[PDB]
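Re: your question from the hallway

Yes, I did run it. Sequences:
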Amino acid sequence: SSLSDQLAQVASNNATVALDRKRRQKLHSASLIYNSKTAATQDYDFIFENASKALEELSQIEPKFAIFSRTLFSESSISLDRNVQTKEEIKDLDNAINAYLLLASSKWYLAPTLHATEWLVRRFQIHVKNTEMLLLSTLNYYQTPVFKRILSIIKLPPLFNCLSNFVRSEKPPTALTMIKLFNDMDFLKLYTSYLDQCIKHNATYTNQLLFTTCCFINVVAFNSNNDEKLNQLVPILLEISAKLLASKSKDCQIAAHTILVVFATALPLKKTIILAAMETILSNLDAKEAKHSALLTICKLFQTLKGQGNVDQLPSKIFKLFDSKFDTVSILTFLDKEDKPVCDKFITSYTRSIARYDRSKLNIILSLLKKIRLERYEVRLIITDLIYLSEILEDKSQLVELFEYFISINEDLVLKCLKSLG
Amino acid sequence: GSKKKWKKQRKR
Amino acid sequence: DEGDINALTKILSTTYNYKDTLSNSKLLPPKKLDIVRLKDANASHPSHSAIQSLSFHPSKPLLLTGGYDKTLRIYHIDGKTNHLVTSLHLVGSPIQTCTFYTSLSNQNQQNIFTAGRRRYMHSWDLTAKIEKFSRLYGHESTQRSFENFKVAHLQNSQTNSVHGIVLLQGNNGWINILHSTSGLWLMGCKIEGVITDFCIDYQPISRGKFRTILIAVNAYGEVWEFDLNKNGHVIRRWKDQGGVGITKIQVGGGTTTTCPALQISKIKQNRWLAVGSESGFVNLYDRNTPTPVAALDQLTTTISNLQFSPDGQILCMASRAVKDALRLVHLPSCSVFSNWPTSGTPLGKVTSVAFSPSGGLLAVGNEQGKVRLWKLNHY
Amino acid sequence: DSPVLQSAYDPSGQYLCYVTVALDKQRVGVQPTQRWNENFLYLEDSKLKVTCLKWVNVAIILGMNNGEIWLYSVLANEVTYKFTTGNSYEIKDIDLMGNQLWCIDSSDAFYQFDLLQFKLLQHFRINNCVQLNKLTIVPAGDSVAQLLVASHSISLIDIEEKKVVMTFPGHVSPVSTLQVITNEFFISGAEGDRFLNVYDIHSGMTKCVLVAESDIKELSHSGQADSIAVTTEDGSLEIFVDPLVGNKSKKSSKKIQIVSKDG
Amino acid sequence: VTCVGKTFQIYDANTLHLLFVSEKETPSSIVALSAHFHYVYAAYENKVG
Amino acid sequence: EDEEDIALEFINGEKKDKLVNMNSFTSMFDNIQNVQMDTFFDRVMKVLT
Amino acid sequence: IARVLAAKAAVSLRYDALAEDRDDSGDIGLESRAKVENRLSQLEGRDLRTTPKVVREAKKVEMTEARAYNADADT
Amino acid sequence: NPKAFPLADAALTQQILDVVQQAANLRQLKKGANEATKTLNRGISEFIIMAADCEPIEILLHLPLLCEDKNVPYVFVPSRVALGRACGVSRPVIAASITTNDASAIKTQIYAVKDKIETLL
Amino acid sequence: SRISSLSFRTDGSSHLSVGTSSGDLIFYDLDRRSRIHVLKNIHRESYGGVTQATFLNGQPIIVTSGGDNSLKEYVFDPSLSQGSGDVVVQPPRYLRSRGGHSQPPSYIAFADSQSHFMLSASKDRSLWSFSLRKDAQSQEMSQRLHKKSKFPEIVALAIENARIGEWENIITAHKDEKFARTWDMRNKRVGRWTFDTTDDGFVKSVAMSQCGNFGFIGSSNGSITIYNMQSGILRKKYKLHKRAVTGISLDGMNRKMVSCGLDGIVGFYDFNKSTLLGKLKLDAPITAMVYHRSSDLFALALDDLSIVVIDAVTQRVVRQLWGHSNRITAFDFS
RNA sequence: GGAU
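Structure:
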């Protein structure tokens, strides 16, 4: 390695040492409330006094802010310098900073958060060391003036190079430049870990999910053409969707209902992945709003399935899960509404599941076929299995009524199914 | 334009 | 270190391949076409004129070419050699259209119909056994030339017999229907305006019974529908939306000239209808006033050719005005394929296209007399 | 190039079986040499190709790329039985003597089959045989005691020992013909090769190197080394008279050509 | 250390420049190669060199 | 009845679905502030439908 | 925006000034307003300045000694 | 479409749709209402063709007021997709105008079609 | 899948590398229980895929080898994220590799007088340059065409170094193929000129003049076509042989040209005046030819298993060699 | 796809 390259690492390591007056000016001038000149004049005590008041206001809105008063916003923290701490203490310090950024995640719209963060910026220089965590957390406050102030006082990491245009710029970062950041493969999985932390902590909030959902959904659109790249998105994003489904929050589950549909239409998948997709969707499905989004989800996925077994019956375990979480009356109501999405393949797969697994439910099958018009082949496949039912299962008034229903509509096809099968 | 005299080219 | 919500994390862990294999996939992918070129048909014996028309044999592995050289050059297409089984020169008979024909009942019967800018038409049964159709039986005024024609199957319901019919374009909206073998003038169909194109679709009625309907379109875009099983009476009327300067009309998804049947039961109805025109749009209609499903706007010149795949999944449209004006559309997505054709793809001035009944071959003729062949790997 | 991918006369020489391509599907047909049959087996799958074709004494054995062997009765125009090897590599070569039927795959594995019993008797792979595009069975008595296997060079394998016996230096190009003209004298040829080398099985020395004008595609032997007929790639037929009687290299004596009246 | 038919070659991993080659070709093809500091053990037929 | 007729009826039965292009979801960012996220899933479905 | 708004302004006006049975709702103006707003979102979204690419410098990697267990102790 | 008056019939539509295409070819056609508006201000238009099916129809009903003031013949056509198509655009056209040029090569056909239009008026 | 190799990295971060016979290399971060990256088709599946893959002891480089005669290097670069580096692993990057023909070479030639490089063609349809020195340096010569799959594998080629660096200096012939492609050693890229036989025959012989300017193509129909290397424009054709020509040489003096073919005659020409100096008939057809420019002697491989040496100056057989028991595959002058 |  060149001496200049080795020397650069030394500068990065000692970025915050404040060897002389000139370096100390650059560190202390960095501010989120005040301009550079006034910032240089301000004192740690003066900054701490405002921050302590700000934290108390934050404590009132959420009690959890009060904990940092014991650790980060303490009077003794004024005399605490990080340069003089050892390795274990610095790792110890950094994580406490990280949790504060997480709890502040839904509150930068509130002014006191901006004041409270100033103490961390001024005392702990989070903008220099915890540059990723600060900037990941404020990704969805981009159009807010606060994010612009962050860019000016922060050295962008390698993964945020696309934002180097908007540093110290009059125009805020546009929505289009973001997709490029998340389009980068290395960022998505970097972003995956931070989202993975929030779900563990249940610190996710709506504005995080809704901003989170669009961009990944947008990354799919920009790259629909590149099939090879979309293949490499599957390990990362479908893993993310699985986690959000694991969350108890209804918002996370539906955010995963947003993510998984768009990949399904953008890229057709193996059927096995989709049946797994059904199971995780239905495993932790409790909320009514998540219930509605999921039921639209399962139908749309079954529209994407396009291979032999496209309309084959659901397995035993999945069929039992679906009826338990979606009693048949609900899907009837799903079929009654005129604006129902195309779900003929799913109903065909569902209909064949009913015949194999439940005998009591045959008469409802008559109702499902009337409500939704199935495709010719879907109709035949049902006729094919229903012929087997007559041979094996006992003749029933409902069973013959299903036949008589097929007698009324498209009579000659019933002969074709009978001709091919007995 | 195409300007073969103009060539018969539909304007997309 | 040493349902079930974590199913997704497991299946992702197992496989690094998440793309469903297209081998099981039965209809072709929307935007990616797996197409590979094969050597041209005419390398064995080049043609000295353009390839005005092209036709694949319904069952045998034969390809028929004709043109202003006045020769019916028929080639045995195998994809690796493509030798010439035979040719047939017809002096004073320029070839504008030629086609294979097999009697729907008598599979043994094979015939070739070829025509041009002449008041007579040549039939060649299968020294050459040839026949000239040159009598219109009092309807000579309506017809000036046999150049544009097609062959369809007509079922005589009152006797249940089935025979071929030769359809022709008249001077003023007239369509003359002739007996394929006897040449007798059977029925005639007339429309308002100048007849530009017409096409045939088959609607099965019951076991062994089917009806043939004549689809005729004017340059203004108004389309007539005649029932040839009922003395050619009109059965429907509708207009092509946004249609002006129409040039060609075609049906797809069932039996047709490009995808003929071998027995009555194989008769199927076409679910697609495309209307070509001078300015280059191709309005696609779902046969299952109407409204077009899509209005394709890629080719910027007059549509000289429209053809659907034997299964009706691909619609091919070509223009002879400029070079490389050839596009393939995926159906029913109505999205043009992007990977093919490319800038380096050799097409020239496309003048003829033919789809093999099976095997997924694409054959395209050009003004230079070159019939270049391609294989669709999906089929 | 020729339309006929593969062709074979029957041992009696009155019937010829040939395979061609219709569209993307290969079709196998049989014609009477002494004197039209419109009936062909049509392989329903494009990927399925025929690699080898033998007459059996009225059926024909056809090895497929799929990894299996089809026994086809020409009269019935249907495949009577399919001997499926467990493994899926294409069959490179295959030979028959009564019930015994020995095949080789692209995985370099010998297998043995019985026509009467319809069973795979044994399967084995031999070292020192990286490739094997030709298998032939030596005509010794009424049982198979040695196998002659060639890809680039030639080798002799013993069935009971499961080991090589002798090695003959073959052509640079892969071997194309490996017929056994007589005892202790077998001919060998290669594609893109104009000579045919006669090897002595017992000794291993090249007796003669028969010279053709152009590349050889097919070889036919008459009697017991009485005459050898080789079809040249240029379309001419060369006949060698008493090739087993300067002496090292011998040329064709009679040449036959076909030209139309036009030219 | 990589086997090449009846002989082996030693390449320096840092630059993959060849360093040593076998003085003589083994009578039989090498089946296994084991390398230990300055000594490389080559196995062929029933003999290990 | 034959299996290829069965296949061609499968081909007939499939219907079109609107493909997702690059500029289908860009407008989602424009209306991203203070929107119920169930209505967001509904809007995504609408543009997909 | 001046050109597109002027075009839409004429569109609304010819309805306002010349509609025989206009409903006093401004609906055509409302849908026309949305179309212009969609224009500004896509037009404003466009970035004249080229985006910088994520720098990925290859780097020369130099080989370093690592202590290893010795098998003589096992024997 | 009651306000749309007079409306060309199917046959009358054919030759006017025929002339615009030739005028479209020969650089003798304007496409768009505002250009159809502006050409009337110059008084360089033989006649103006409008679409009856445009929604809202009030967008193009201003041109008849200009045409009547300037004694310019005008006609209405049922379908707008056909007009823009015949005009030779990839978008629907609700209004079009032909250049006043006594030296044009399709002058007689343009003279022929208007003769129907004032009769229509 | 089918595991063919395994290896742990010992540099202090938590990965396992698994190789498979299909030619893929998967890395699993097995503390995190996740897959890091997969390298697809590094080694040909037909030749056994990844026969061996091992990490160097304590470093981020992994060596890979297979049955396709190639050895590759991949290095795991440092994380691009200042934090959570374990999450942020750079995908492995190709570092450097050695390789060669996947099948036995078909023809070989000496690149330069200094004897530092070798031109090698094989049945794998690739032309390679191999260094003879301890560098072990090698490349495949690029096939990307100039604008005015692999080409069929080479049957014959000629090379001259008089005009290296000015234009194309190498010519090759292909089977079942009717024109000769040019190759440029300095650019290590395909030439911009193609030479056709002009007689509907395949190329059987290729030769050059010592000045590096003329190129001679022998057709299967017996015609000789002479092109010029710089513009690739045909200048001369000679038509004496009726069968395929198997050898062309021009003396270092560029005045007497010699040709031979399967018709068994040997043609003696005057290149300057383009006249037939003489014709000599041999007992057996000729198979191959090599010309010694310093001595003006050339040897011919006959089908009678003999090497006949001829002097062009007086046009007579000077030496005939016997002893070969089969075809002579190749031969050369000292 | 091509030049770059």
